[PDB]
Amino acid sequence: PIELLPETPSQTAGPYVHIGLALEAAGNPTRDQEIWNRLAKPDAPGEHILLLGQVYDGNGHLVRDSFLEVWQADANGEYQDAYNLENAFNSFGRTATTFDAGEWTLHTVKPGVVNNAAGVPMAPHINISLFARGINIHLHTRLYFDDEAQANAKCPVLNLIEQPQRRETLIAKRCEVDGKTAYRFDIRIQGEGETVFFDF
């Protein structure tokens, strides 16, 4: 068969990922421009929401050194790839869990609907990549919203998960923080209630 050049093999990010990708968290001076957890500026169109969650290992213990990358559409269901700190909205962000509480946060807007390759609409979602010490190759997942039940029911992606009970591991639970609309999204790497991870 035809064989291409092999892709460079992945390696764990390690415990010190922060020094490279989350300067502040490593407890180091940051640069003029950093890629962080505020995708939307206050003056950004769409419904401003706060995302938060914890990461659990197979023993039910918090993963305090996780690193996360998010990719989402703007309010119109449009992917804004031209990254600029001057933008009111960036489709891309990064966050990490506190060494203390082990909770990460993201400041964004609820993504609009995007169609799959076949022209079928997917429920609003956030694409997440999980990195950490002990993780040889990053885990891919999706954050869906509990208040989009109608849409969620019809998502061609969510519907590819054989077992209905597993689909729920992907649904963020709506709450309020300081009178603000927030969603809680906990990731369970292994075991009981193990979150669905994707390959694409």
Binding site: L4, L5, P6, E7, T8, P9, S10, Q11, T12, P15, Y16, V17, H18, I19, G20, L21, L23, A26, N28, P29, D32, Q33, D57, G58, D65, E69, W71, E78, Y79, Q80, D81, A82, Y83, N84, L85, N90, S91, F92, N116, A117, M122, H125, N127, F131, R133, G134, I135, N136, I137, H138, H140, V157, L160, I189, Q190, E194, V196, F197, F198, F200
Partner: protein, 233 residues
Amino acid sequence: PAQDNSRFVIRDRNWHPKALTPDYKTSIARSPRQALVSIPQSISETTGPNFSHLGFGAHDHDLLLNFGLPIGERIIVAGRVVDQYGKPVPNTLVEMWQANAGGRYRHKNDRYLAPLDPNFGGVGRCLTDSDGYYSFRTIKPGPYPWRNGPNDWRPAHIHFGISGPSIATKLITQLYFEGDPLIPMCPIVKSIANPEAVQQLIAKLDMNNANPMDCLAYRFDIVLRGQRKTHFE
């Protein structure tokens, strides 16, 4: 905004290290027990951020100047980022981090007794050029003991993060140095089952790129998933 025009060669999950690799102790509790769910590529996965407009500082990529002079072997780490088809990956984000010459990391959690270097931070970023080329100027990091087995030592290594054209191509890896005897004993390295895959992580001495009487150089090329146009979809 981003457009769903490309498809990415499927990842070989036997080439890459598996999730569960017991000798690397941390992997045990941090690896899923359920099989990954495969999904068709959509605009969601085939797009990703373009960092062309990120405002990079002048010494973003120069670890000798970006934090006096650091102590250690002065080296240039350069290479090219290409896809599996051998196509250069222009204007892509390359991030790296590492320990100092003594193997000490400038991070809160690093308790190793090797001292910090007052002139060394250990972080760099570079946007590849029109030809997929990048380069950093740093000092060669030292091996680092870690609490895995009772006498485990990571080979000297640099951590790398490469964005590529989409989140499907995004990759985090580690560069190792040619000839390093610690390489074959490392459980993280050995997370990779194929010896040939291991070779891909080894930077080669590059006398041609060195600055005589100044610094040596190492060559590290990176290969991202091959990008193709959709067809007959």
